[PDB]
């Protein structure tokens, strides 16, 4: 109706009274308390108000000579950052969702449950037909030595029945090695210093 | 020691999150076009 | 743009850098091989993964002859 | 027309000066399509008539890089036709003129990798590292 | 798997008609592929090397069924233990 | 000293009071579940489309 | 090179090309201003900072990026941005069947009617006429040429004549 | 509708006579899926058009896929694991439809699915949330890997032997069953 | 091969979307090209607001 | 050839109904002739400065003094058909503004927050 047109214009400007400056805007944390429906509602309140204000600003700009400047301009600023803050909050929530989604999706992928032709995938060991063997060794062995020694004797292939051989140090002994070599460097430093300090007195 | 040259603008939240920096920049820019505060122009070339 | 930059070519060995590419095979014209695995790996993790039998087998220096490309001189030793 | 006193020809002298987006589109291989070589040299399992998932296949395989796939496994015997896009992947991804400054000064010859035109920082210590590396040797 | 490795070219079919109308189809690294069943066995250098290979795989399985493979591997393990 | 300023500015009709504005409506787990599920749907959908054209 | 120049007396630095390039930025704030089709790096990189954090945050799966839920599309669907503003001189004390709106140029004739229906509840709109007017250019007192944003003038034809009265 | 627990299918292998398999359905734990399956077995195609209706439509509206497991096939049959069929728009194994739309979803039903016993029926789907007409009958002892993936809406109460019968069909190089396994007729036992 | 190619497609996309386009983190020409003098600063952003 | 359909190069009918620049919401299957590539950069400018002179004596696209932005056009929502002047092939590109109202405490909310 015409009542819809009145919201574009300023009420107290319409009655010629001075527009008052509002107390402030929606801060971030106040919006953090709000749910999504509330957020988009006050978004639309801010939208209607902002449109109203823009129309007013342009009207005063339109007749500069007669009207002067726009009374209580500081509202625009307020309302703008209000909207900005809403965006902020929403962004945050979205990215949270996104993160969560991602880690779900990927753990689906590593389960490998998707197949283009609609249906279940084949069961997880049906295809593998391989067996891994864990060996402990006191010393280090070159892997080719292990490959000739543990290779199938009946298989005639250059691999001799061995798909691959991988050597590792457990992380316990690895940590042991780095700790020990730190102590070794400090040791060399200390014996060097002992020799260097007491060289002169001796 | 500065992580940006002294003459750069500060565009960021008070927390330091750069999440909104493009909105902030856009805002500052539309604001440099037509400042909301702006009083009567004394120029002969006037927007209306 | 290149997703998955390919690894250096001959880098199979733990404590010593690969031979210069183009000698193994590829584009010629640099005298030193380099691999970011062997560089980024801390010195202690290099020494931890080796022994003084293996170290001296890949420390081995064939002087002018090149191993991977037989009969010719090794490129690093050549001026160009 | 770019020559005039008009403002369209005034813009065209200026607007046409900015530089377009550049990516290195490295050439397509229409006749050797690496992605169809997965099905090469595979034994058939004759019940299901599907391929046999051979565990030896994946260590002999040669990984052929490209842009819109990560890498493509290919049997080794067929690797020899793909020699160029192995050199385009290892290449720096620009015109070399843009990155050429790495070449001219001395400090950047020693710190940067030049193998088949990949200009990329070698591993280089920080200063505190250098200090504590030279200190515990007592030098 | 091999048929998937040979290069396919996208062009006219009638120019393909034209080039083996002439002798142009075999020249510039182009060749035509007609799947065969049996081959020429003499002077075929692929054939000979791989049937030699078959011969040593046959004598290898003779060695396996006889059991010297077992003994060789066991003495390898023995000399590894002895060293 | 403090920065005390015009407290003489106010707009009661058009302003939200504090007890109104500070009400927490954010229950996060429920709406989080909704969001996450409807991201999941699209991610899965495009992935199965990729599977299709592969 | 019938005769070689003396090039050994110059240190190596690239001279500026004498037909010097003008800066790529567009200085003309008039009527005839052209939008530059050419895309620089900065556009894409700022996209990438805007949509997800590109420097720091890991990129989301493509399926998300190309979907309605992806943040700039999500936020656009549930938190729309338009300044649809009204020229008051059309609706001031005269009865007018045709109020005149300023509109962001990316709106159609349909989207305006949707806007007025669902937000302002203006349910009778016979039709919309659309002009694209370049934003208002002005100089200030230092002589800085400034241009307010481009707009779309929509004459909106109603069933019932509408006035907004001014109390004198 | 609980007492609609049973729907049956007549399965023919090539030129073989149709043999009946009778399902037992679990409407309480998953109403949506079962509601789909039942009505796909019933299939009211009972709308018969007229001359003027033919002139008015001018599309021949029976040209759409008609939502019945009749004249549908088992496209994917594999030994020891399971048997899958039920695509309506074409019998070639892709392209799901459901009664509700193209594909439906029921998140709280999918989470609750457990596949433990053989002769168990579930929806063949591409993703946990796109579910069509396609079903699979699980012949293996335990598939525990489909849990958060599929949805179990029923079991085979009668005709297990029919399953094992059509499971032994040889597969030709095309990847399908060499002998065409067709669903001749369907009905709900109410 | 189908699933693996799909997966490699996905991570290839996300990495090429991570690594492109490549704009340097810092170069001296940023501070060089962003320095303006005082006259240009005043003649860039001035409004009536300061004097009023 | 051309990705964009051929009715926006030469017209859908004889009077050149559908030619000009067309921008697409990039969630939509249909595609426009606005491409920012170097090789396309001449002809988009060729529309913005010249416009096109149709053989029917009327100059399409930009005939005037104000060159149109191809970037801020509203999205291409369909394709022209001779019967009904414009077919909407895609409705999902038209923004339907929808606002939740009179829910909960929403009535009490006001555009600004007060002071202490
Ligand atoms: Mg430097």
Pairing of strands F15-16, J112-113: parallel
Beta bridge partners of residue H177, listed in sequence order = H171
Distance C34 CA to ligand 1 centre (A): 20
Q: Do F48 and H126 touch (CB under 8 A)?
A: yes
Does E8 touch chain D if contact means CB atoms closer than 8 Å?
yes
H39, burial (CB in 10 Å: exposed 0-12, middle 13-18, buried 19+): middle
Please report residues of A whose CB lies closer than 8 A to that of C13: none
In our burial notation (b when 16+ CB lie closer than 10 A, e otherwise), range F9-31 reads eebeebbbeeeebeeeebeeeeb
The encoded tokens of residue J103 equal: 């829910």
The encoded tokens of residue C63 equal: 């002087």
CA distance linking residue H61 with residue I21, whole number of Å: 52
Q: Give yes or no for a contact between G149 and G135, defined as CB atoms under 8 angstroms apart.
A: yes
DSSP state of D35: G
DSSP state of E65: H
Q: Do D41 and E7 touch (CB under 8 A)?
A: no
J48 → chain D, closest CA residue: D8
Query: Smallest CA–CA separation between J6 and chain F, in Å?
Result: 27
Across the interface, which of I31, I34, I49 has its CB nearest the CB of B35?
I49
Query: Smallest CA–CA separation between B30 and chain I, in Å?
Result: 12
Cα H81 from chain centroid (whole Å): 17
Helices (H), A34-170: 36-62, 64-67, 74-109, 143-150
Q: At what angle do helices B21-33 and A74-109 cross, to 10 degrees?
A: 150
Distance D95 CA to ligand 1 centre (A): 19
**Physical contact, G and E (3 or more Cβ pairs within 8 A):** no
CA distances from A90 to A46, G72, H71 (A): 15, 11, 51
CA distance linking residue C4 with residue D65, whole number of Å: 7
Across the interface, which of C4, C29, C34 has its CB nearest the CB of D65?
C4
Q: What is the resolution of this structure in A?
A: 3.4
G22 half-sphere exposure, CB direction, 13 A CA radius: 11
Taking the CB of residue J17, how many other CB atoms lie within 10 A of it?
A: 16
I9 half-sphere exposure, CB direction, 13 A CA radius: 18
The encoded tokens of residue H116 equal: 């433990």
Q: Do A119 and H140 touch (CB under 8 A)?
A: no
Q: Give yes or no for a contact between J20 and J43, defined as CB atoms under 8 angstroms apart.
A: no
Query: Smallest CA–CA separation between A60 and chain J, in Å?
Result: 22
CA distances from G97 to F35, G111, H1, H71 (A): 45, 20, 59, 63
Query: Concatenated DSSP letters for G32-91?
Result: SPPP-----HHHHHHHHHHHS-SSSSPPPPHHHHTSTTSHHHHHHHHS-----EE-HHHH
Q: Do D14 and G41 touch (CB under 8 A)?
A: no
Q: Do D47 and H79 touch (CB under 8 A)?
A: yes
Does D118 touch chain J if contact means CB atoms closer than 8 Å?
no
Across the interface, which of G35, G73, G114 has its CB nearest the CB of J97?
G114
Q: Give yes or no for a contact between G101 and G130, defined as CB atoms under 8 angstroms apart.
A: no
3-state helix, strand, coil in chain E (%, to 5): 65, 0, 35
Query: Smallest CA–CA separation between C77 and chain D, in Å?
Result: 16
In our burial notation (b when 16+ CB lie closer than 10 A, e otherwise), range D90-113 reads bbbbbeeeebeebeeeeeeeeebb
Please report residues of J whose CB lies closer than 8 A to that of F49: none
Query: Smallest CA–CA separation between D29 and chain I, in Å?
Result: 17
Distance D108 CA to ligand 1 centre (A): 6
Distance B6 CA to ligand 1 centre (A): 23
Count CB pairs under 8 A between chains B and G.
31
CA distance linking residue A103 with residue A118, whole number of Å: 24
Pairing of strands G127-133, G137-139: unpaired
Q: Do A30 and J99 touch (CB under 8 A)?
A: no
Q: Do C2 and D89 touch (CB under 8 A)?
A: yes
Does C21 touch chain D if contact means CB atoms closer than 8 Å?
yes
Q: Do A115 and I3 touch (CB under 8 A)?
A: yes
CA distance linking residue H137 with residue H158, whole number of Å: 12
Q: Which of residues 44-103 of G touch D (CB under 8 A)?
A: 44
Does B3 touch chain G if contact means CB atoms closer than 8 Å?
no
Distance D113 CA to ligand 1 centre (A): 14
Q: List all residues 6 or more positions away from A94 whose beta carbon is below 8 Å from its beta carbon.
A: F35, G71, G74, G75
Pairing of strands H19-25, H152-158: antiparallel
The terminus-to-terminus CA distance of chain J in angstroms comes to 67
For chain E, the farthest-separated pair of C-alpha atoms sits apart, in whole angstroms, at: 73
Query: Smallest CA–CA separation between F51 and chain G, in Å?
Result: 12
Solved using = cryo-EM
CA distance linking residue G95 with residue G89, whole number of Å: 11
Report helix, strand or coil for E36: coil
Q: Do G79 and A90 touch (CB under 8 A)?
A: yes
E65 → chain A, closest CA residue: A154
Q: Do G34 and J41 touch (CB under 8 A)?
A: no
């Amino acid at each position: 109706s015409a009542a819809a047109f009145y919201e574009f214009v300023d009420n107290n400007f319409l009655n010629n009274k001075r527009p008052p400056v509002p107390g402030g805007s929606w801060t971030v944390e106040v919006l953090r308390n709000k749910s999504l429906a509330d957020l988009q509602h006050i978004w639309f309140l801010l939208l209607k108000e902002r449109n109203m204000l823009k129309s007013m600003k342009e009207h005063y700009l339109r007749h500069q000579e007669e009207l002067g400047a726009m009374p209580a301009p500081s509202r625009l600023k307020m309302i703008d950052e209000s909207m900005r803050n809403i965006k902020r909050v929403v962004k945050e929530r979205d990215e949270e969702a996104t993160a969560r989604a991602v880690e779900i999706f990927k753990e689906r992928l590593k389960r490998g449950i998707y197949r283009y032709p609609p249906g279940p995938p084949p069961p997880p060991g049906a295809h593998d037909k391989t067996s891994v063997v864990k060996v402990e060794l006191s010393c280090y062995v070159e892997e080719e030595r292990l490959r000739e020694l543990f290779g199938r004797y009946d298989v005639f292939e250059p691999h001799k029945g061995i798909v691959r051989v991988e050597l590792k140090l457990p992380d316990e002994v690895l940590k042991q090695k780095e700790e020990a070599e730190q102590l070794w460097t400090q040791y060399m430093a200390e014996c060097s210093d002992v020799k260097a300090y007491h060289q002169w007195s001796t | 020691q500065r992580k940006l040259p002294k003459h750069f603008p500060v565009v960021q939240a008070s927390d330091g999150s750069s999440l909104l920096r493009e909105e902030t920049i856009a805002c500052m820019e539309r604001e440099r076009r037509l400042p909301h505060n702006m009083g009567k122009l004394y120029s002969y070339h006037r927007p209306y | 743009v290149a997703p998955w930059v390919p690894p250096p070519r001959h880098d199979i060995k733990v404590t010593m850098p690969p031979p210069p590419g183009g000698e193994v095979g590829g584009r010629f014209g640099v005298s030193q091989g380099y691999s970011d695995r062997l560089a980024r790996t801390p010195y202690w993790k290099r020494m931890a993964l080796s022994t003084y039998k293996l170290r001296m087998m890949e420390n081995a220096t064939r002087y002018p002859m090149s191993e991977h490309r037989p009969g010719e001189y090794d490129i690093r030793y050549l001026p160009t | 027309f770019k020559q005039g006193q008009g403002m369209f020809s005034h813009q065209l002298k200026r607007l046409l000066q900015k530089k377009s987006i550049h990516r290195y589109n490295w050439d397509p291989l229409p006749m050797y399509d690496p992605r169809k070589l997965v099905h090469a040299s595979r034994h058939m399992d004759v019940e299901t008539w599907r391929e046999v998932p051979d565990p030896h296949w994946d260590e002999r395989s040669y990984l052929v890089p490209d842009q819109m796939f990560y890498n493509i496994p290919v049997p080794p015997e067929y690797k020899d036709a793909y020699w160029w896009r192995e050199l385009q992947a290892r290449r720096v991804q620009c015109p070399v003129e843009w990155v050429s400054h790495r070449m001219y000064n001395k400090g950047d010859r020693q710190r940067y990798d030049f193998q088949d035109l990949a200009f990329r920082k070698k591993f280089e210590f920080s200063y505190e590292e250098v200090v504590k590396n030279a200190k515990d040797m007592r030098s | 798997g091999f048929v998937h490795a040979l290069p396919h070219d996208t062009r006219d079919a009638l120019l393909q008609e034209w080039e083996r109308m002439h002798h142009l189809d075999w020249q510039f690294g182009k060749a035509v592929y007609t799947p065969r069943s049996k081959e020429n066995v003499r002077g075929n250098l692929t054939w000979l090397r791989e049937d030699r290979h078959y011969d040593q795989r046959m004598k290898f399985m003779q060695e396996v069924e006889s059991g010297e493979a077992r003994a060789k591997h066991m003495k390898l393990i023995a000399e590894a233990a002895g060293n | 000293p403090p920065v005390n300023d015009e407290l003489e500015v106010g707009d009661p009709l058009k302003d939200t009071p504090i007890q109104d504005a500070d009400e927490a409506t954010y229950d996060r787990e429920a709406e989080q579940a909704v969001l996450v599920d409807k991201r999941l749907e699209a991610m899965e959908e495009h992935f199965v489309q990729s599977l299709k054209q592969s | 090179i019938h005769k070689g120049w003396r090039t050994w007396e110059y240190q190596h630095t690239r001279p500026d090309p004498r037909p010097f390039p003008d800066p790529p930025v567009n200085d003309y704030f008039g009527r005839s201003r052209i939008w530059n089709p050419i895309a620089c790096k900065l556009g894409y990189v700022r996209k990438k900072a805007d949509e997800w954090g590109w420097p720091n945050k890991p990129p989301p799966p493509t399926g998300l990026r190309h979907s309605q839920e992806f943040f700039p599309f999500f936020f656009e669907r549930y938190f729309p941005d338009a300044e649809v503003r009204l020229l008051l001189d059309s609706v001031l004390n005269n009865e007018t069947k045709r109020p005149v709106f300023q509109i962001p140029c990316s709106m159609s004739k349909v989207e305006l009617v949707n806007y007025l229906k669902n937000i302002y509840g203006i349910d009778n709109v016979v039709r919309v006429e659309v002009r694209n007017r370049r934003g208002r250019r002005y100089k200030n007192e230092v002589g800085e040429i400034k241009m307010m944003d481009d707009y779309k003038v929509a004459v909106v034809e109603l069933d019932t004549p509408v006035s907004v009265e001014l109390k004198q | 509708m609980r007492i609609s627990e049973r729907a049956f299918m007549d399965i023919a292998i090539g030129t073989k006579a149709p043999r009946r398999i009778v399902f037992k359905l679990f409407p309480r734990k998953c109403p949506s899926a079962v509601k789909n399956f039942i009505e796909l077995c019933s299939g009211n195609v009972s709308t018969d058009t007229y001359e003027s209706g033919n002139r008015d439509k001018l599309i021949s509206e029976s040209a759409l896929p008609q939502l019945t497991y009749k004249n549908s096939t088992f496209h994917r049959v594999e030994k020891g694991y399971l048997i899958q069929g039920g695509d309506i728009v074409t019998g070639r194994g892709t392209e799901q439809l459901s009664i509700y739309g193209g594909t439906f979803s029921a998140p709280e039903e999918v989470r609750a699915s457990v596949f433990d016993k053989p002769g168990l029926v579930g929806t063949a789907s591409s993703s946990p949330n796109a579910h069509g007409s396609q079903f699979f009958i699980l012949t293996a002892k335990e598939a525990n890997h489909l849990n958060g993936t599929c949805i179990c809406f029923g079991q085979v109460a009668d005709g297990l032997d029919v399953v094992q019968e059509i499971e032994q069909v040889p597969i030709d190089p095309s990847g399908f069953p060499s002998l065409k396994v067709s669903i001749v007729d369907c009905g709900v036992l109410e | 091969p189908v699933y693996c190619e799909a997966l490699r497609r996905e991570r290839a996309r996300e990495e090429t979307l991570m690594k492109w386009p490549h704009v340097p983190e810092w170069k001296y020409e940023y501070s060089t090209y962003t320095r303006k003098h005082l006259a240009d600063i005043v003649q860039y952003n001035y409004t009536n607001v300061v004097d009023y | 050839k051309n990705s964009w359909p051929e009715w926006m190069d030469n017209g859908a009918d004889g009077t050149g109904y559908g030619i000009g620049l067309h921008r697409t919401h990039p969630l939509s299957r249909l595609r426009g002739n606005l491409k920012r590539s170097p090789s396309h950069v001449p002809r988009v400018l060729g529309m913005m400065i010249q416009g096109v002179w149709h053989k029917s004596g009327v100059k399409l696209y930009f005939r005037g003094g104000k060159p149109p932005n191809p970037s801020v056009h509203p999205y291409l929502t369909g394709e022209p058909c001779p019967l009904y002047g414009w077919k909407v092939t895609d409705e999902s590109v038209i923004r339907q503004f929808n606002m939740p109202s009179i829910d909960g405490t929403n009535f009490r909310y006001k555009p600004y927050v007060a002071l202490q």
